């Protein structure tokens, strides 16, 4: 996983 998402890009913290 990556850093924590945020609005505007699809990915799981």
């Known amino acids: 996983k ?3 998402v945020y ?3 699809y ?3």
């Open 7 to 9: 609005r505007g890009i």
């Open 11 to 13: 990915r799981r913290r």
């Open 2 to 4: 990556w850093f924590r």
